[PDB]
Amino acid sequence: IGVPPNSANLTEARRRVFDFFRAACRSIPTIMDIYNLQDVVAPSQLRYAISAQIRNNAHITDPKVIDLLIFKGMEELTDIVDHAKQRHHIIGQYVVGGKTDFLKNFYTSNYF
Amino acid sequence: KDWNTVFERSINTLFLTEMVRGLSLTLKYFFDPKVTINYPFEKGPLSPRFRGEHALRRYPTGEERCIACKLCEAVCPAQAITIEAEEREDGSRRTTRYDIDMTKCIYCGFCQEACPVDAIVEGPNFEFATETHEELLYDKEKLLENGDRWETEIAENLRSESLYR
Amino acid sequence: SKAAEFVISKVDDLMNWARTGSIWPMTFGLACCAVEMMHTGAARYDLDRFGIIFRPSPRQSDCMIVAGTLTNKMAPALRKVYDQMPEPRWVISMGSCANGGGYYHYSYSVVRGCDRIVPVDIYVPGCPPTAEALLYGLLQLQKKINRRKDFLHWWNK
Amino acid sequence: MMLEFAPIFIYLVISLLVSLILLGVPFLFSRFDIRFYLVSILFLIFDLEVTFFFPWAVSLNKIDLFGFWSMMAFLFILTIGFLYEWKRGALDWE
Amino acid sequence: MRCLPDGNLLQTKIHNIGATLVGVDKFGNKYYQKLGDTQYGRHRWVEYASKDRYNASQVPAEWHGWLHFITDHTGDELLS
Amino acid sequence: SGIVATVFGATGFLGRYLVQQLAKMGSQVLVPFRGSEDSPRHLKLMGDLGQVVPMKFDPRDEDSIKAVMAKANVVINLIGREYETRNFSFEDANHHIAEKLALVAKEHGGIMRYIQVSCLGASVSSPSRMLRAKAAAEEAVLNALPEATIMRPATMIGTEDRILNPWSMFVKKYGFLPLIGGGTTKFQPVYVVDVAAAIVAALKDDGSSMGKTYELGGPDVFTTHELAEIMYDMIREWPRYVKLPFPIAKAMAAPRDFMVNKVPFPLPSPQIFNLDQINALTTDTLVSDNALKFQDLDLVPHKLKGYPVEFLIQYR
Amino acid sequence: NFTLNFGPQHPAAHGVLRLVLEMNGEVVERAEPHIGLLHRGTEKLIEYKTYLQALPYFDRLDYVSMMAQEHAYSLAVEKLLNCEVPLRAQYIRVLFCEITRILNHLLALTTHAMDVGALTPFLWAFEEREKLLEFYERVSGARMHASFIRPGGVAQDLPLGLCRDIDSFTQQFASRIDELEEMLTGNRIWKQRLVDIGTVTAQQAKDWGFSGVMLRGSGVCWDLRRAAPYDVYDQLDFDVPVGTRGDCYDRYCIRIEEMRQSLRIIVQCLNQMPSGMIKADDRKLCPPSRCRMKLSMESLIHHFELYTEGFSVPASSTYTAVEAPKGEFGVFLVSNGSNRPYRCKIRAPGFAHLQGLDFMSKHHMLADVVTIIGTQDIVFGEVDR
Amino acid sequence: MDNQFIFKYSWETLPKKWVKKMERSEHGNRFDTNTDYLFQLLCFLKLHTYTRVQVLIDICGVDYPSRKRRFEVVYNLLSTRYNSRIRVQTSADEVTRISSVVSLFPSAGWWEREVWDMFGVSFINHPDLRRILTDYGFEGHPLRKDFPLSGYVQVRYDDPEKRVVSEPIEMTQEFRYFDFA
Amino acid sequence: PLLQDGPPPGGFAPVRYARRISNTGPSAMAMFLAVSGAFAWGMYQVGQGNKIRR
Amino acid sequence: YIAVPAEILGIILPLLLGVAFLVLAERKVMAFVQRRKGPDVVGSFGLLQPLADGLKLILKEPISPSSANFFLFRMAPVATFMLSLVAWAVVPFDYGMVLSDLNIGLLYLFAISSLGVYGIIIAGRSSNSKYAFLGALRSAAQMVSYEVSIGLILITVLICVGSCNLSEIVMAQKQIWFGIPLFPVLVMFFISCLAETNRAPFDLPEAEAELVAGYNVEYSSMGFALFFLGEYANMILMSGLCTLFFLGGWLPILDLPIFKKIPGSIWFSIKVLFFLFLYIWVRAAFPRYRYDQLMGLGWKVFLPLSLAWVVSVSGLLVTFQWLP
Ligand SMILES: NC(=O)C1=CN([C@@H]2O[C@H](COP(=O)(O)OP(=O)(O)OC[C@H]3O[C@@H](n4cnc5c(N)ncnc54)[C@H](OP(=O)(O)O)[C@@H]3O)[C@@H](O)[C@H]2O)C=CC1
Ligand code: SF4
C-alpha cells in the first residue's frame, strides 16, 4: 500500500514493471466502458500502446528511474479509471482510434 | 441529590423554560427599527480613501497630468496596465496608449500611490457593471472621460486626504 | 394587426414583470467574493426585499452568481450545475477572478474568466465588488430582462 | 345519514381539476435499513391502538367502569410490548 | 400611482414625510435629509427625477459624495 | 486569419459546429439573429473576446441585412426550414431569403467568398416542396453570384439533430417506432461536424471551389430501418416496429399542413409526421457519382457509429 | 459500505467543499476531503512578484481574516530585514488584528449556527460585521483586502475621528455578544447538536498539528500571543480560554470568550495609542510623503526606486508565525538577496484542521459532519492557496 | 529552554553521524541531516525527555537548480513543552525516495502529498501518496523553477463535445517580466 | 500635521466585556401549581359544561 | 347540489390566496426579527410578491428527468396538494359555516393525515436519486412517528367531547376552552403539528446545507410549487385544529355581550393567526434537531405523555361522572 523503497536491482525493477503492466492491462475493460470505445478502438490496441510505452523505455539502466516511471504510470492509470477526462480520440495522453517533411514544415511556418 | 433540586430540573425540562427566553428576545427585535438601506434611493457610507473605478486626470488648463513615467505599470501586482508613449508634436512626453484591464485589476490602489503627478486615481465610483467583457477593457480615452465626469469629487477627496499622505 | 401587437406587448410586460420581480439565484461561492455576496443578502442590503431568494439546487434557480476564482479542477463542476438550470436562466460574473482571472490570470491552474465555461449576462467589477456594487449589478440584470419580448418573437416565428 | 359525504366527492373532483390546470399550464409555453421496518411496525401497532380508542372514547358514558378497565387491560398488554421494544433498542436511531 | 407597483419608491415617499429639501441637481433629482438618528444618524436620500426607469448611475459627481457621506458638502456647494 | 464572415442562420443545429470551426481558424464571425437575444447565447462561448459577434436583424428588411453584412468579406447562408409556419412559406424560408441575401451581397461588392448551404435531394422535379424551393434557391443564388459555392449535405446526425432525437423521444414515450416507407429508403446520413469541416475547407482553398456544387454524404449508405438499429443499439432498448404505409403516414401528416395557413395562431413543429419530409422519403437520396464529394476537399467523412451517435447515451 | 459523495456547493457550507463519505446507514465510517478546487498557484505567483507586489496575495488566503495574514507577512519581512517598527504602528497593527479576530469569529460562529438551523444570529452578527468593515474602509479605502499592514508599519495614519467611532462600537459590543449567547448557549437543541461532538484529546491535537481554538479546546494552554509575543501584545491584559472536554461545545464557548477578550484588547489599544510615526523612518524601505517626493531630489529617487525595483532583502531563510483567528499562520520565507522572494511557503492552520476531519468525524452521524466542519473553521483560500 | 541550550545539548546527546550541519541563529536553530537519518533524528527529538518536539508545523520543498541534489526538504517542528522551535533540513534529487514520517507525525500525510505534487519528491512507506492540489491528470511539478508560470495547458468549454476540455495554452497578453536588477 | 487621532484627555469611558446575567422567570413551583390548578378546575368546568349539554 | 361547486370554490380559491400570503407573512416576520425589511419592492409593502413568484414559477420550463417513473414523478405533488386541500371540507369556521357536517369528522382528519405520507414517499422513490430517496424515507418515518401522538391527543379531546363532529367539539367548549385544563396537551399538540408538517425545528427537507437532500430536490417549476403549497396549506390547517380543539373555535374569549358583537369567523381567524405567528416565531428562534434526536423525541417522549394523558383524563372523568 505504502510507497515501497527504491528497487535494489533490475530483477526487482522488472518484477515491478511486469506487475504494473499486468494492472494496466487488467483495467482495459473498465476504460472501454467508461469512454465508450466499443466502436472506436480494439482492446489489443490499448494493450499495444501500453507495451509500446514500456518498450520505448527499454534503454534505462538505473532502477531508481524505473521506479519513478512505474509510479508515474500508476498515478496516470488511476486518474484515467477514477477521474476520467473524456475527449473524443484522446484517453489521457494517448491518441485513441511525395514531398519530404521539410517542404511541409516550410509551407506551414518559419518555426520548425 | 435532593428532591427539591430534582424537582426543579424536571420541571425545567418538561416546560421548556429556556426555550421561552429565546422566544422573548426574538420578539424584541420584531418591533425595533430596521437597518435596511433603501437602495438605490439611499446609499451606504463610504470614505474619501475608497478605491473604486480608475480615472485619468488633467490639469485645470486641459493638459493631461500623465507623463508616461510607467511607474504605475511597473508596480501593478496584476499587470493590468499597458502603456505606450512617444514624444508629442510639441515635444511633450505623453502616452499614446494607456489601457487598464478592469478584469485583471485587483483594485489595490498601488498605481495611485506610485504616480508622481496624481494622474491615475481610483475614484469613488463603484457602480459600473457591464453586459460585456470588452467594456471592462478601458482605453486611454475612456479613462480620461471618467476623470472629466468625476473630477469635482476626486479633487475634493484629494484635498481631504492630502493631510495623511 | 393594430390589436394583436397591443395584447402581445401587455403579455410580454407581464412576463417581464414576473421574471424581474422573482429572481432566485443559485450561489456559487468559490472565494472571497462570496463573503461580500453574503453581506448583500444580509440585513443592511437585504436582497430578499427585491424578491431575490437564494436557492440550493439549480432545478429551482433562475440565475447563477459566480463569486470567486474558478480553477481548472472546478470548471467541469460549474458547467454541470449550469446545465441543470431550467430556462430562462442568467449568469452573473462577480469580481475580477470570475471576470477574467484577476490576480491569478497567469496561473497554471486558473480559468481565465468564467465566460470561457458558461455564457455571462452581467459582469460586476471589483476585487471584491462591494455589497452595493453587486446590488447595482443585479438591477442591471433586471434592466436586461425587461428588454425581452418572448411572446412577440414566438408569435412571429 | 351519509348525505354529507357528497360535497367531499365534488370537492375532490374540483381539487383534481385545479391540480391538473396548475401542473399543465407550464407544458404550453440497494441498502436495506431495518430501522424503517421497525418504525413501520411500531406505527401499525399504535395505529390499531388509536383505532380501538375511537369507539371507547365515544362510548365511555355507557360502558362505565367495566369498559374502562377492559380498555386499561388492553393498554397494559400493548404497553408491555412497548417496554419490550424500548429495552431492546428499537426506539434508538443512533 | 407608481407607488402601487413600485414598493421601492413608496418607501422613499414615506421616509420623505417630514424631510428637508437640500437641493436639486441638473437632471431634476431631488435631495432630502432628516437630521435624526435611526441608522446612526444617516438620513440622506435622493428621489430620482424619473419615477420609472431610475438608476443609481444618474447621480452626478457633485452629489455622489454627499449621498455616500464621503463629504458634508452638498452638490451645490461643490459646484460653487 | 483576416477573414470576417457573416453566417446567416447560425442559431440552429449546423450553425454551432460551423461557428466553432470558423473561430478555430482565427476568423471573426458575425451572427445575425431574428428573435430573442438568448438565441445566439451559446455561440459567445466560442472564440476569443470580440471574435463571435451576434447582431439583430429582420429577414424582411433589406436595411438590416446590409447593416450586418457591411463589415464582412465572406458570407455563409444556413437559413432554411423543413416545415411550414403561417408567416413563412417553404419558398419564403428556402428561396426568398436566400435570393435576397445574394442580392445584397452583390450590391455589397466586397464579398470575396459566398457559400449557400442546400439539401442533397434539391431538384426541380422533387416530391418535397422544401427541396423544390431549395433547388430554386440554388439557381437563384448562382444567377446573382456565379462565383458562389453550393453545398448539399444529407440528413445530418448530431446532438441536436431532428431525426434520431425525435425517434428516441417517440420510442421512449410510446414503446415502438413507425417506418414511413417500410424502412427501405436509402439515404447517406452525415456527421454534422463533417459538414462544418467541408464548409471551412471550401473557405480555405486556393479559389478552386468557387462556382461548384458539392454533395456531402456519409461514408456508408443506410435504410430507414438500418439507422433505427443503430439507435436501438445505442439507447439500449428493445426494438419494436409498426410498419406504416405511405397513404396512412400522409394522412397523419395532413392536419398540420392543412390548418397551418388557416388558423391565426402558431402550431407546434412536426417531429416525425412532417408531410414534406414524408414526400422526400418516397425516393432514395444518395450522392451522385459525377458530383464532388468529401474526397474533393481532401476530407474523409466520419463513420456514424461511435462518437457521432454518442449523444444517444442520454436516453438509456 | 456504500459511499456518499456530498459537496456543499454554495455559501451554505464553504462552497468548494467536496467530501467522500463512507457510511454504515447513517453512521460515518471514513471521511475523505478532496481539495485543490481553490488551488490557484499563489506560492508560484509570489516568486514572480516584488516583496510589495506579493503583499495583496496574503489578504486572499484566509479571506475572512485579511489583515492578520498581512501582519504575518510583514513580520517575516521585517525579521529578515531587521527593521524596527514605530510604537504607534505596532498599536494600530494590534488594534486591527483584534478587530480582524472579531470579524472572523462573528462569521465562523453564525455560519455554523445557520448550517444547524439557527437562522437569526447570522443576521444580527453581520450587522456588527458591517460596522467593523467600515473601519477597514476608513483606514485603507477597501472593505476587505485592505493591504494596510506593510513591512515597516502601516500604509497610512488613522483618519481623524476614527478612534472615537471605534470606542462607540466597543461600548455596545458586549450586549451584541450576550444576545448571540442567549440565543445559543443555554438552548437545549444547540447543546444537543454540539456536546460530545468531534471530541479531540490533547495528544491527538498535537499529533495532527492542530492550533488555535482547535488546540485550546483540548485543555492545552497555548496562544502564540503569549508564547511568542509580537508587536505590543506583551503590554496588554487578556485571558487565554481553554476547554475541558475538547468537543464542539467547548470550541464554541472559547470563540465566544475570545471575542470578549478581543474587545478587552481593543479598549486597551484605544486608550494606550501613542502619537508618532506609523512608518519606519529608514529611507531605504518606506515611501516618502507626497510633499517630500515632489520637493526633494533624494525623496524622488527613493520613491522611483521603491515603486519600480522594490527593496532588496538579504539572503536568508526563516519561519515566522502569528496567532491568526483560525490558528497558527506561518510563513517560511527564503530570500536570495534580490527584490523578489525566492520561496514563500505558506503554512495554513486550515490545512492541518481539515486533514483531521477523518478522525474527528469517525462513528458520528451524517448530520454531525457539517457541525465538525463548522468548529474547524475552514476557509479554502488558505487550505488550497 | 532557549536556542543556546538546544544547540549545546543536541551536540552532546545526538549520535554524531546524524547531523552534518548545525546553524545557531536568530533566524532559527537548524539541523541538516542525511536522508537516511531523517526519520531517526525526528523520532529522537519527539521522544527524548529534554527535547519533546511533539508538533510538526509543516514540511516544504525548495528547488535549487544549480545543485546536484536540487531539492531541499525542510521540516519545521515545535515543542509546546519547552516553547521552542527547530528546523531539520535534508536534500534530495528527482529520483531518490526519502523516508516518510507519517508514523511519527500523522499531520505529515497531506504535507508529503503536497511535496510530491509540487516538486516530485517521493516518500517511502507513505500510506497514500498522490497529488492533492493540482487538477487530475496534471503533468509536471509546478513549484520546480523550470516549470513555466502559466503552465502548458488550459481549459475551456467545447460546445461540439458538450464538455470542458484541455488544450495547449494561448495567451492574449503574455506575462511581462520586468528585470529591475 | 501634528494632530493625530487618539484618546480624549482622560481616556475613553470604561466598557464591559463580561456576560451581564439576567434572572427572568417564575420557575419551579409557580408553573407546576398554575398548571395543576388549571387542570383540576378546568376539568370540573368540563363536567359542568357536559351536564348543561346533556 | 348545483350551487355546491360555488361553495367549494369559495373555499379553495381564498385558501390558495391565503397560502400565497402566508409565504409572504413568513418572509416579513422573519425579516423583522432579523432587523431586515423583507419583500417590499414588488408591489406596495411587497404585497404583489406572491403573484410575481407564482407567475415566475408557471413560466419556468418543466424538466421531467429521464426516469422509468414518469407518471408517478408528476403525480406525487398532485397527490400531496389534493390531500392538503380536501381536509378543509369538514372544517367549521363559525356556527353553520362548514361544507360537510361529518359526524365522523375527527377520524376523517386523522385519515387524511395518514394519507399525507404517500406524496413524499413516491416523490423520493420516483426521482431516481439516492439522496432524494433517503431524505424521503426519513421524512416519511418522522411523519408516521408523530401521527401516533397526534392521534392519541385526538382521543383525549374526543373523550372530553364524546362526539367526532367538529362543530360539536367546538360547542362543547362553551363552558371552558379545552386548552385551559389540557394546556400540556395543547403544547404537545402544537409540537406534534410542527413535526408532522416537517417544520422547524423538525424540517429535515430544509437541511440541504447539512448534507440532507430533501425529497423534492429534483422537482422544478410547478411540481415544486405544488409541494410547497401543500405544505403551507397544512400549516394553516394544523393552526385551525389547534384553534378548534383547544381554543374553542369560533367562540369568544368571554361570554359577554361586548365580545359577542364581533362574529365567530373573526374569532376563529384571529386564533388561527396567532398559531401561524408561532409557527414562524419558532422557525425564527431555534436551531434544528438531527433525525435521530427527533425520532427519539417522537417515540420516547410524546407517545408516553400522550398515552398517560388519555389514561388520566378518562380516569378522572369516569371517577366523578363528568363524562359527556
Ligand atoms: N437534417 C438536416 O439538418 C438537413 C438540413 N439541411 C439544410 O441545412 C441548413 C442548416 O441546417 P440546420 O442548422 O439543421 O437547420 P435549422 O432549421 O436547425 O436552422 C436553420 C436556421 O435558419 C433560421 N431560420 C429558419 N427559418 C427562418 C426564417 N423564416 N427566417 C429567418 N431565419 C430563419 C433559424 O433561426 P431560428 O432558430 O431563429 O428559427 C436557424 O438559425 C438548412 O437550410 C437546412 O434546410 C441540409 C440537409 C439536411
Ligand atoms: S488598482 Fe492595483 S491592480 Fe488595479 S490597475 Fe491600479 S495598481 Fe494595478
Ligand code: SF4
Ligand atoms: S499614470 Fe502616473 S505613474 Fe502611470 S505612467 Fe502616467 S504619470 Fe506615470
Ligand code: SF4
Ligand atoms: S476577485 Fe478578488 S475578492 Fe473576488 S474572489 Fe478573486 S481575489 Fe477574492
